[model samples]
Each structure stands twice: as C-alpha cells, then as structure tokens.
Target: MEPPVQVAVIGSGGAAMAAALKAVEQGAQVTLIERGTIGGTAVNVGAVPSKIMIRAAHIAHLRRESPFDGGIAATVPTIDRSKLLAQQQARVDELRHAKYEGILGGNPAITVVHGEARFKDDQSLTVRLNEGGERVVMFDRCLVATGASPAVPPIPGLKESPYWTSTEALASDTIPERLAVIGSSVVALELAQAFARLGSKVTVLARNTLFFREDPAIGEAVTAAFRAEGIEVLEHTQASQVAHMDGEFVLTTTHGELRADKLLVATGRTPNTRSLALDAAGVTVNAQGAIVIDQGMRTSNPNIYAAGDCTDQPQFVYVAAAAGTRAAINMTGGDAALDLTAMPAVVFTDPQVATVGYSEAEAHHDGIETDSRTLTLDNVPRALANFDTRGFIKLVIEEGSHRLIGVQAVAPEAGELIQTAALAIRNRMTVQELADQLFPYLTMVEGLKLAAQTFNKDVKQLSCCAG
Candidate 1:
C-alpha cells in the first residue's frame, strides 16, 4: 500500500486552518506553519476585532440617540472606552484560542510550526522560527494561504507621520476628536461610520464612489447613509499627501486640505506572496503580486495550491475556507473543483451591502440577457414597521428563463437577508417560484419574496401577506 501523502499548509488563517483540518481528515500527514497569531487577520484584527468595535459603537449610538415616547436622557450610559477596548481584546483572544487553537489541539496528524515560511522548491519550505530557530519541512503537496495585509499607501509623508491602519483603528482605546479616513473601500467605510457613531467627527476621502464595482445605487445609498450618520464623505477626492503638525494630522487632497486628529489610509490590500519566494518555487503571481491560481486553487506548480487573499481571488473568509478545503481535497487526489459560482460578499456597515452571484452587468457581459429589479427597503414590511428604511435590494434574473442569477442588498441585516437570496440563486429558483414561497412576515429576508413579486405586481397594492 502507498504511504500517506505529506501535505504542508503555510500561514495561519481561515484558509490555512481549513486546508490543514481537511488534509488531516483526508488521512494525510498535515503541518501548519505560522509566524504570529494563530487565527491570522480574521480573528486577530480584521473581522472579529472590527465587529467588536462596531458593536460597541452601535450600542453607544443607540443609547445616546434612540428615543421613545417617554424616555429619560439619563437612561443612556457613558462608555468607559478603556474598559470597552480591553473587553474587545479579551473577546478576540478568547475566540482565537477557542476556534483556532482549540480545534487543532486534539488533532494528532497535524503538526504546528511557528515561523516565517519561504519556499525553497515546489515541495520544500525553509522556515525562520520566530521563537529563535530554523526548521525545514518537505511535503508532497503544499497550500499557500498567507492572507493579505491592509495596504500601506505611498502618499507623501504617510510613513513619517503617525497614522492608523484598520488594525490600529480597531485596537485603539480612545476615539479621536476628528478622524480622517483616506479611501472608500470596505475598511474605510466601516471604520469611518464606526468612529462617527462613537462620537468622533469622521471624514472619508475616496478616489471614487464607494462600492464602484457594484450597482451605482448601492454606492449612492451607502454614501447617503454615511452622511446621515454625520460622517463627511468626499467622493472623487484623492489624498495626495499627509502630514502631522501641532498635534493634528493634515491631509492634502485634490480638492483641498483637511485636518483631523488621526489619519487612516485604506486604499486597498496588496497580497502577501512577496516573501514566499514563489518565483523560485514555480508559482506564478499576477501584477498585483497575488499568487496566480486557477479556479481549482491550483497554482502554476501542480504540486502547490493557493487560496484566500494571497491569491488573486476574492478576499473573503468564507471563500478562503471553501477554497482551502477544495485545494486539500484535490491535493489528496480527490476530484474537487473550486466553486466561486455562488460566492457571497458583505460590507459590514450600519446598512450592510451584501451581494451574491454576478452583477447585472456581469450577467449581461456573460451573454445571459439579464433582467433586474430594485426594491427600496422603504417598501419592505420590516423596514416600514421599524422605520429603518435605509437601503435597497436588487435581484437579477435571466431575461427569458426568469432564473434568479444574483442578489444585492443594502440594509440592516442585509448580510443575513442575503443568504436566502443566495440559496435561491444557487438553486436556480425562478421569480415566480420565489414569489410563491412562504416567508415569515416582517423579516428582512421576506423582502426577497416581495422583490420577486414586484417583477409582476405592484407589491404596495397587495394586502398584507396575501400574495
């Protein structure tokens, strides 16, 4: 009988973690290599920490601003930011240990190595151990999942001045009097709104419209929402330079100069493949320095695979996990194709932007003759009941077949509401079928059924839940 396949998964993140666990489950000898935190950006800095901060900010906003018929101003409590930040850190640490480290603790087939790993060849790695040593690991198959870091932009005086990236912003104990965020990406929008709700005067400078890649209505609605939250938006503005003076950060933009107590550069993320020596290992990288891979997570070298933000694929935790597992299965000689056909993405803001499958333009570009409808959340029953109508839901369907192909939503819990639409799209459900489906009254997801029904009837004219 042939010996067990040796698989080495590099970096410690969602992708690497999933790949390692799946490889072990596949009866392969698995090794996980890490240089810093066990859970990488998702648990350490990006999703977990950011969400914690947003939760705190949101609670603070609610207590201070929300009012009832007979409410006492004293009902709102002031936040001890120091304590709040400490607890957030505690939560992140706990989640990292529980979800990441604990999962690997009882697994014997997977060996964990802490270090900076570089490829010596297609099948070999040289790790510079951080605890003060070196080690070499050889494998029959490899998965590279070193996730991306927040981009450090090349604006003049940026490095010289004290500026906050997403990591620093999420970890900070105190909110600045004025915060200037220099970009319109997901990180910039979320952080800007979070700080604004936490009582900071936040200004967002964007090179272009927010979510420019999606439906233009999404960007317009989101920008309006940010402004309604008292966050200043400078769309089509570019930050050319940054400087610190008189205890304040000054940003020079194409329009004018702006001053703030803190600065955040959130242009975009570059890949983490530079240090991996992929060039020598026969792994090809794209122009963005991201490892180039096929949809199957197969790198240029057949023996090596790549996933997550390290590759030129989507930078999502769920996508990373799925791709990593697929890579592991294929590595173990199983037939699995990496599936991005129905991927879901979300921007975590007050009114989240959730999207699944292709955009209306994308569907048309693929020659599928697309038909779409946009339903304002004002028309959604749940939003009307709560008076939280702040976004819209757009669903795309095939022109003739009426097959659901895509769904984009922007509203409170749009992230959760999208899963139903995603399921429908993935299952190739038609508009009529989705409309006929039973849904609970006054739920954000029920809007999907209403949206489908809108393609034919005037949803407003229909009696309550009678359609």
Candidate 2:
C-alpha cells in the first residue's frame, strides 16, 4: 500500500478539527497544533455560551411579555449571575470533552501539539509549545486554520480601560446593572438584546447603520423590536473617548457623553495571519490581513491551504467547517471545491433576523432581473395567534423564470423558518411550485408559501389555507 499521506493542521477551531478528522479518516498522518483552549471560540465562547445566555434571557423575556389573558401575576424571573455563569461553564466543559478531547484519544494517526505555529518555509514550521519546548514539524501538506480575535479600534482610551470583548462578556460572572455596547454586528445585536432582556439597562452606540448592507426594512423592523423591548439603539453614532470614573465607565460620543457600569465592543474580528509570518511560505493576504483563498481554499502556494475565519470565508462556524473538510480532501490528493450557493446566516436576537441567497438589490446590482415581494407578519395566522406580530418576510425571484432566489425573514423563530427557504433557492423552486405546495395552516413556516402566492394575486382575498 502507498505510504499514508502526511498532513499538518494549525489551530484548534472548528475548521482545524474538521481538517484533522478528515485527514485521519483518509489514512493520513496528521499533526494538530494549538495555542489556546482545545474547543476554540465556537464551544468555549462563540456559539455555545452565547446561545445558552440567549436562551436564558429569552425565557426571562417570555415571562414578562406573556400574553396569557388569565389573571395570574406573571413575574419576570431574575438571573442568578454566578449560578448562570457556572451553568454556562459546565456546558462548555461537557461539550469540549465529548466533542474534542474524545476524538484525540481515539485517533492514534493524529498527534495533538499545544503551541503557537509559525512558518519557517513553504513546507516547514516551528511550534513554540505551551509547556516550554520547541518542535519543528515538517509536512507534505499544511493547513493554516488559525481563527480570529475581536477587533479593537484605536479609540482614545478603549485599550486603557477595562472594556470587554465577546470572550470577556461570555466569561463574566457578574451581570452589570448598566451596560454600554460599541459597534453594530451580529454579536452586538445578539448580546445587546440578551443583556437587556436579562435586566441590564443596555445602550448600543453604532458607528454606522445596523446591518447596513442588508435591506433597509430589515434594520427598520429590528430597530422597532429593540425599542419595544426597552433596549436603546443609537444608530449612526460613534464613541470618541472611553474612561473609568468613580467606579463607572464613561464614553464620549459624537453626540454627547454617556456613563455606564460596563462597556463591550463588538466592532468586528481580525484574522490570526499576523503571527504566521506567511512571507516565509509565499502566502498572500489582503489589506486587513485576511488570507486570500480561491474557491478551492488554495493560497499563493498550492501546497499551503487556508480555511475558516483565517481566510475570507463567511465567518460562520458551519462555513468554516465545510471549507476545512474540502481543504483536507484537496490536501490529500483528491479534488474538492467549496460550494456556497444559498448559504443561510442568522442573527439570534428576539424577533430573529435570517437571510439566504441574494437580496433583490444585490441581484439588481449584479445586473440580474428579479421580482420581489414583502409580506408583513400581521398576515401570518401564527403571529396573530401568538399576539406578537412584529416583523415581515420578503422573497426575491428571477423575473422571467420566477425561480426563487432569496428569502429574508424577521420574526420570532425566523431562524427555524429560513432553512426551508434556503432549500427552495438551492433547488431552484419556482413561485408557482412554492405556492402550490402543501403547508399546514397556522404555522410560521407557511409564511413562505403565503408570500410566494402574493407574486401573482392578492393572497388576502383567498380563504384560509386556499392560496
């Protein structure tokens, strides 16, 4: 038999794990290197901890926002800060062991090395191990999967003050009574609403429009939801100075100065390309230092592959995993390409925002003719039944062919509803096919069918379940 293909993976993130596992399964000897926690951001602080906090906040919100007419004084549950933090830590520990450490124990073909990796040449690297030793690792193929860290802008006093990043926010055991959030992105919105619902007086100051690249209606609906929930969202505003004064934090903005007990920044994240010294390996990076990769996940040097947030791939965990899997295949003498058609992304806030494929404006900008329609949540029987009608669904279709190309939704459970739309766009479902499909009445997902029927006729005129 041919000698097992040799592969080396750097970092311990979702992408790194995917690459390592795929290589081992293909009878390849792999070296996995890491400089931090084994589970990386997804399990330790990114998705797992954030979602757990969001779930707790959502439950607290439901008790206060319950629409039950029967008179039984529904009191909002209070968050036991230390207990909640303990619970979150326990969840992380459980997942890390079951998902990552278990894999290492089972695979002898894989060697786990703890270190900071740097490229010495196109085919050689030196790892400064965590326990104080150095190891030079040589491989036939190498994957740079080092992920990203929260971006910190050069504001006046942000660096000097005790400000929190996403990781810090997840690790905190005490919930502040007054919270100030800087920047507007997925993390900003999700954590802002989460803390506000959990009883923090939250203020969000955005340097630009929230989700600026999306449909205007998308941000408008989300803003309305935030306002109704008592979370203050200040758009098109920026902070110029940060200071700690008399046991509190003060931020000077373009408009005025505001003080809070805590400050969190979610401006963006930066790739870990700086430490790699890619110049030695002839790898190319962008202005922001993101590794440049083609659809095949190749760098300037074909032998060196990069994936996940380290590259320009979409910053979702699932996207990174898929890219890593493809990188492993190509690194081991197989042909594979990353397919991103109709990929779905979600903002896990209350009245969640979800999108897939191209927006109508994006299509028009690309010179593709398309038809579009937006349907309000008031028309959805489920929303009316729940007594919380506060968002809309929009659909984009190719003009002449009427094939569904995109879908955006803003409503409670929108995340759950968007996958069906993603499938329709991926499968090239036409408007008529979607309209004629069977949808159980009084379900939020059925809103897609209702919106599709609106393309040719007034869906309001049709009888219940008779679109």
Candidate 3:
C-alpha cells in the first residue's frame, strides 16, 4: 500500500480538532499545533463559559420577577458570584480535557504539537515550539483553523485605558454596580442585559439601533423590552473618547460624559490570520483578513485549506466543525462540501432572537418577489398560558409559490423553534403545508404553525386546534 497522506492543522479549536480527527480517520497522518490551551474558544473562553454566565443571569432575572408573580412570590436571590465563577471554570476545564485532550491522546494517527506555526512555504510549516525548540513540519496538505479574536474599536485614549472584552466580562467574579457597554451587536446586547439582570446599572451605547442589519422589528422589540426592564440603551451613539481614572471608566459620547465602574467593548471579532504569514504560502485573505475558501474549504493554494472563524464563513462553532470535516474529506482525496442554505442562528438573550434563511429585504435585494406576515406572541396559547407575551414571529415566502423561505422569531426559547423552520425551508415546504401540520398545543413551537396559517386565514378567527 502507498504511504498515508500527511495533514498539518494549525490551532486547537473546534475546527482544528474536528479536521485532525476526520483526516486521521481518512488514513491521513495529522500534526495538530496549538499556541494556547486546547479546545479553543468554545470550551476555554467563548461559548461554554459565556452561556453559563448568561444562564445564571437568566435564573436571577426570573427570581426577581416573572409572569407568574400573581401566584408565586418573587424573591431576589443572593448573588454569590465566586461560586458561580468556580462552577463555570470547573465545567470549562472538564470539557477541554474530556473532549480535546483525552481523544487526541488516545489516537495514534494524530500528534499534538505545542507551538506557534507560520507558513515557511506551501509545503512546510516552521513551528516555534512552546518549550523553546524550532522544528519544521512538512505535509502534503495543510489546514488553517486559528479562529479569531475580539476586535477592539479605535477610540481616542481607549487603548491606553483598561477595558474588558467578552472574555474578561465572562470571567468577571463580581458584578459592577455601574457597567457601560460600547457595542450594539450580538455579544454586546447579550452581555449587556446579562449584567443588568445580574444587578448592574447597565448603559448600552449603540452606534446604531440594536440588531440594525436584521429586521427593523427586532431592534424595536428588543429595545422596548430592555427599557421596560430598566436597562438604558442609547441608540445612534458612539464613544468618541474613553479613559479609566480613579478606579472607574469615563466615556465621552454624543449625549455626554458617562461614568461607570466597568466598561465592556464587545464590538466584534477579527479572524486570526494576520500572523500566519499566508502570503508565503500563496494563500489569499479577504479585506477583513479572513482566509478565502470555496464550498469545499479549499484555499487559493490548492494544497492548503482553511475553516472556522479564520475563513470567510459565518462564525458559529457548528459551522466551523462542519467546514472542518468537509475540508478534511477533500484533503484526503474524497469529495465533500458544506451546505449552509438552511443554516440557523440564535442570540441567547431573554426573548431570544432566532433566524433562518432570507428576510424580506434580503429576498428583495436578491431580486425575488416575496410575501410575508408577522404574528405577535399574543396569539399563541403558550404565551397566553405563561402570561408573557413579549415578542413576534414573522414568515417570508415566495409570492407565487408560497414556499417558506425564511422565519424570524423573538420569544422565550426562540432558539428551540428555529430548527423546525430550517427543516421546512430545506425541504422546500410551502406555507399551506406547514400550517396543515399538527404542532402539539401550548408549546412555544406551536407559534410557528400559527404564523404560517396567517398567510391564508386569520388565526384569531379560528378556535384552538381548528385550523
């Protein structure tokens, strides 16, 4: 038999680990390099820890007040943040060891190298080992999965002052009495409300309305909800200057000077491709420094591949994992491609925002004629039962065929309801077909059927389960 293919993977993230394992399974010898702790952003500092903090905040919010306050007494729970932080870190450490280190140690086909790797050429990587030795790794094919870092905005005096990024915010042990956030996107909004619920007098400075690029209703609904809960959201505002003085942060914005005990900058993330010296390998990157890749995850250099946040793709961990698997397949002489047509996205704030496929404006911009309807949560029996009607669901369809093209929902557990819509769109189901399907009553998912029925008839006119 011929010798096995050699695959070199940089970074020990979801993409890197997934690619290394799949490549090994395909009879490829793999060298996985890491410059930091294994299991990458998801397990170390991003998804796992952030969600734990968010969930803790949500529980605290419910304890303070909920729709069932009329029957159940609402009590403010004592916040013991050190304990929560300990629990969060414990889980993070457990997952990193179990999922990343354990598997890699048992695999003979994969070698884990601790180092910083840069492209010496198309066929070799010069790894500066963490233990102080320089070694060159040669491979028939290479994969870049270095992931991304939190992007800090350029503000006068900001860099000189102390500011917390998402990583720092999530790791914080004590809630600030006054917290000021300077972003308006997913990370900004999620952590802003989280801190507010956790007892911080939170102020959010948005350069534009929250979720400005999404459906306009999303920003309006979320903003209204935030205001009702006592969090201050300043739309169309930017911090022209920032300074930390006397143990507090001072920000000068369009409105005026605002001071807080802590400042969080959750602007966005930038791909970690700059230090890779990609040009030496004939690889091309986009304006944002994201590696350019095809559906098969092949980079400009045919022998090289990339995936995850470092590549030009949506920065969801699941998307990264899928792309990594496909990249490994193609590198090992197999055919594979990643299909994102029915991909779903979720934002984990209370009254979560979940979406799949085209919005009305996106369809229109793509030259497709669309018809749509929006159904408020008041019409859903589950929302009525819970006595918490705070959001709406909207459906977008092709005008002529009535094919369900998109669904956007802002409601409690909206994340749970989006996958069903994704399945409908993936199967090219129509509104009539979705409306006719039976959804168990009094579940949040039932709102989807109610919204679909709005296309042909008034859902309010029919009795429960009569449609």
Best by lDDT: 3
Candidate 2: regions farther than 4 A off: 69-72
lDDT of 1: 0.88
Model 3: per-residue Cα lDDT at residue 271: 96
- Evaluation by TM-score, superior candidate among 2 and 3: 3
RMSD of 3: 0.9
In candidate 1, what are the lDDT values of residues 80-109, reduced to their tens digit?
A: 779988999999999988889998777889
lDDT of 2: 0.90
lDDT of each: 0.88, 0.90, 0.93
Considering every candidate listed, which one attains the maximal TM-score?
3
Q: How many clashes would you count in candidate 1?
A: 0
Residue 432 miss distance in model 2 (angstroms): 1.2
- Per-model C-alpha RMSD: 1.7, 1.1, 0.9
Point out where model 1 deviates above 4 Å: 67-77
- Ranked candidates, highest TM-score first: 3, 2, 1
- Clash counts per candidate, in order, are 0, 0, 0
Candidate 3, residue 174: how far the Cα is off, in Å? 1.0
Predicted candidate 1, C-alpha RMSD: 1.7
lDDT of 2 by residue, 1-467 (tens): 67887798998789999999998888899999899989788999899999999998988888887666466567878779799899989999999999988987689999999999999999989999999989999999999999899999999999989999999988888889999999787999999998898889999998877877788888889888998989888998899899998999999998799999989999999999988989999999999899999887889999999999988788998999999999999998889999898899999988899999989899999998999999999999999998888999999999899999999999889998899999898889998898999988889999999999899889889789885
